[PDB]
Design an enzyme around this catalytic site. Structure first.
Site, PDB file in Angstrom:
ATOM      1  NE  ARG A  19      -3.217   0.066   2.786  1.00  0.00           N
ATOM      2  CZ  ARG A  19      -4.553   0.188   2.237  1.00  0.00           C
ATOM      3  NH1 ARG A  19      -5.055  -0.376   1.371  1.00  0.00           N
ATOM      4  NH2 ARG A  19      -5.314   1.392   2.661  1.00  0.00           N
ATOM      5  CE  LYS A  23      -5.187   3.603   0.119  1.00  0.00           C
ATOM      6  NZ  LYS A  23      -6.414   4.192  -0.557  1.00  0.00           N
ATOM      7  CB  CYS A  35      -9.151  -4.555  -0.332  1.00  0.00           C
ATOM      8  SG  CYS A  35      -8.253  -3.336   0.766  1.00  0.00           S
ATOM      9  CD  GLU A  55      -6.714  -0.246  -5.213  1.00  0.00           C
ATOM     10  OE1 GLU A  55      -7.708   0.240  -4.411  1.00  0.00           O
ATOM     11  OE2 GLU A  55      -5.743  -0.828  -4.904  1.00  0.00           O
ATOM     12  CD  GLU A  84     -14.355  -1.803   5.828  1.00  0.00           C
ATOM     13  OE1 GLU A  84     -15.831  -1.501   5.536  1.00  0.00           O
ATOM     14  OE2 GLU A  84     -13.789  -1.182   4.767  1.00  0.00           O
TER      15      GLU A  84
HETATM   16 MG   LIG Z   1      -7.685  -0.168  -2.218  1.00  0.00          MG
END
Ligand SMILES: [Mg+2]
Length: 151
Positions: A19, A23, A35, A55, A84
């Site tokens: 990532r 982020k 994700c 992405e 989540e």
């Molecule tokens: Mg993502």
């Protein structure tokens, strides 16, 4: 409400991603391919397809549902809380990656068995959802199916 996806190439290698440093949550952390969050009225399948384009600039095969019941809460190194609903999918890429560096700062094509060994030995070096998804027995067997060579 969210989704996660594990992508493989036709040779059966797994794509792991890192990532981006910018982020909000888990910046700089190694994790499964993609994700995100579906939009209002969007199917999870279509969200997966959309985020892979966004992405990773890549096209994929129809996402397969491998862990529909996955739902978790996890807290990030800075304390960001995330709770989540996050059904998991797997797919194969059908075109070359074109990396969005707003989202992804690094990636690796890997052997699934190596990745699973790393996850099992040093889970702290990976995002907590990557680890919780891969340690689900049924999901793990689906990841193994995607390591087959597809000609
Ligand atoms: Mg993502």
């Amino acid at each position: 409400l969210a989704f996660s996806s594990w992508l493989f190439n036709a040779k059966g290698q797994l794509l792991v991603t890192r990532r981006a440093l910018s982020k909000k949550a888990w910046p700089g952390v190694w994790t499964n391919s993609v994700c995100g969050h579906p939009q209002l009225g969007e199917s999870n399948e279509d969200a997966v397809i959309r985020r892979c384009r966004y992405e990773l600039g890549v096209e994929i095969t129809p996402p397969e549902s491998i862990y529909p019941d996955f739902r978790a809460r996890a807290t990030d190194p800075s304390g960001i809380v995330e709770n989540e609903v996050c059904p998991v999918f797997a797919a194969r890429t059908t075109s070359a990656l074109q990396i969005n560096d707003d989202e992804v700062m690094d990636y690796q094509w890997c052997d699934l068995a190596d990745v699973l060994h790393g996850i099992d030995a040093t889970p702290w070096a990976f995002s907590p959802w990557m680890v919780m998804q891969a340690t689900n027995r049924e999901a793990r067997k689906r990841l193994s199916a995607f390591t087959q060579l597809k000609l």
